[PDB]
């Protein structure tokens, strides 16, 4: 039956409407300037649960999602045994201008969970299993001329976020990667600024080109966050961010300085920073060498920090690959099953 759009290009629909005389809406799950994501029953797969992404009837959002779908196709094509932890897309159609993409319902994101637990960090066993899934999934993606570009706790969902009480622990540490809306093939237009602030690597800030090494940094940042419960780089300005990195991580390689069109942030090869000034006192207090954030001395932890540091190399050409990461002695600590 006839549908309708609003003054802004959103499909008009609430809980109880159908699309394709197949999908029944029964929940709201997310919204934005892309459109809606609604829970549905696939009344042509015995009423099984789906997340349906419904995109605004607008040129740029609709073309953005043409590519989102190409990526999901490539993935489904490559991960037949269903083993590479990237979200399965079950369906996709152009509904009266609106692109819709259905996926398997999943549970809470690793951000929602963390904040529902008062920002106390995941045990290290959990950190290890999730780091492993993440390394496993994006390696798959990277041997397929793809880069995700927007990895963060919000974009990683528990299959099943049922928790126990202790302070909360997730019964099941299985996660999916999600939101391939930003993912770029090696051969296609690289958007310049990419990733959300906290998870953004230096070669992007310095506008020096990016590729797969972009996602590895994102992961290094995310693991720090799983391990401490709080972000590595708590800033919203490019100059402070580069200074925090240097204070947490070490001196930027001078070749990356020689090369960046972002000269404004540098004088005679040094970053411009007022140590003795409001923002100074704060970063001096708070931004410390990576090894300082270790919460215990034991091996598992040292093994973790070596991976994080390798994931957080300034020179993207130097940074660890995820194929390398998979062999790291941090991942000798894994059970048979967790393997």
Supply the minimum distance, in Å, between the C-beta of residue 179 and ligand KHC: 4
Told to check if 51 binds ligand KHC by CB under 6 A, we report yes
Q: Which residues of 73-93 are buried (b: 16+ CB within 10 A; e: fewer)?
A: ebbeeebeeeebbbbebbbbe
Told to check if 103 binds ligand KHC by CB under 6 A, we report yes
Separation CA 52–CA 18 (nearest Å) = 12
Does the annotation flag 53 for ligand binding?
yes
Does the annotation flag 249 for ligand binding?
no
Considering only 106, 135, 311, 325, the residue that binds ligand KHC (CB under 6 A) is 106
Considering only 6, 27, 30, 251, the residue that binds ligand KHC (CB under 6 A) is 30
Active site residues: 150
CB atoms within 10 A of CB 36: 20
Mention every residue, 6+ apart, whose C-beta is less than 8 A from residue 189: none
Told to check if 99 binds ligand KHC by CB under 6 A, we report no
How far is CA 48 from its chain centroid?
27
- CA distances to 121, 166, 199 from 117, in Å: 8, 11, 22
Does the annotation flag 73 for ligand binding?
no
Residue with the two structure tokens 């996602």:
215
Told to check if 54 binds ligand KHC by CB under 6 A, we report no
Supply the minimum distance, in Å, between the C-beta of residue 103 and ligand KHC: 4
Supply the minimum distance, in Å, between the C-beta of residue 305 and ligand KHC: 29
Considering only 13, 29, 159, 256, the residue that binds ligand KHC (CB under 6 A) is 29
Continuous H helices in 99-154? 110-116, 124-142
Does the annotation flag 35 for ligand binding?
yes
Does the annotation flag 250 for ligand binding?
no
Separation CA 177–CA 151 (nearest Å) = 8
Question: Which residue's C-beta sits nearest to ligand KHC?
Answer: 30
Per CB under 6 A, residues contacting ligand KHC are 29-30, 37, 51, 87, 103-106, 154-155, 157, 178-179
């Amino acid at each position: 039956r006839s549908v309708e759009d609003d003054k802004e290009g959103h499909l008009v629909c609430r809980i109880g409407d159908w699309l394709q005389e197949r999908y029944e809406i029964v929940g709201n799950l997310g919204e934005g300037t892309f459109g809606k994501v609604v829970e549905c029953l696939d009344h042509a797969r015995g009423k099984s649960q789906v997340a349906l992404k419904i995109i605004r009837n607008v040129g740029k959002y609709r073309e953005a999602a043409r590519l989102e779908i190409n990526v999901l196709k490539k993935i489904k094509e490559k991960d037949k045994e269903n083993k590479f932890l990237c979200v399965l897309m079950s369906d996709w159609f152009n509904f009266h201008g609106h692109m819709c993409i259905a996926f398997e319902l999943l549970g809470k994101n690793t951000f929602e969970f963390l904040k529902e637990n008062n920002f106390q960090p995941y045990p290290l066993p959990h950190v290890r299993h999730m780091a492993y899934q993440l390394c496993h999934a994006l390696r798959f993606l990277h041997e397929n001329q793809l880069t995700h570009t927007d990895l963060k706790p919000e974009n990683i969902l528990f299959v099943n976020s049922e928790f126990e009480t202790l302070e909360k622990s997730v019964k099941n540490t299985s996660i999916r990667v999600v939101d391939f809306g930003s993912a770029t093939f090696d051969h296609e237009h690289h958007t310049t600024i990419v990733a959300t602030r906290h998870y953004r690597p230096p070669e992007v800030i310095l506008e020096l080109g990016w590729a797969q090494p972009c996602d590895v940094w994102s992961i290094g940042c995310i693991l720090f966050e799983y391990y401490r419960g709080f972000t590595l780089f708590q800033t919203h300005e490019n100059r402070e961010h580069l200074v925090m990195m240097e204070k947490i991580l070490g001196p930027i390689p001078s070749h990356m300085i020689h090369r960046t069109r972002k000269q404004k942030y540098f004088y005679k090869g040094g970053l411009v920073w007022d140590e003795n000034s409001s923002d100074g006192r704060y970063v001096k207090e708070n931004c410390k060498p990576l090894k300082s954030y270790m919460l215990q001395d034991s091996l598992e932890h040292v093994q973790l920090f070596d991976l994080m540091r390798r994931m957080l190399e300034f020179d993207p050409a130097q940074r660890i690959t995820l194929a390398e990461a998979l062999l790291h002695p941090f991942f000798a600590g894994l059970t048979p099953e967790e393997r």
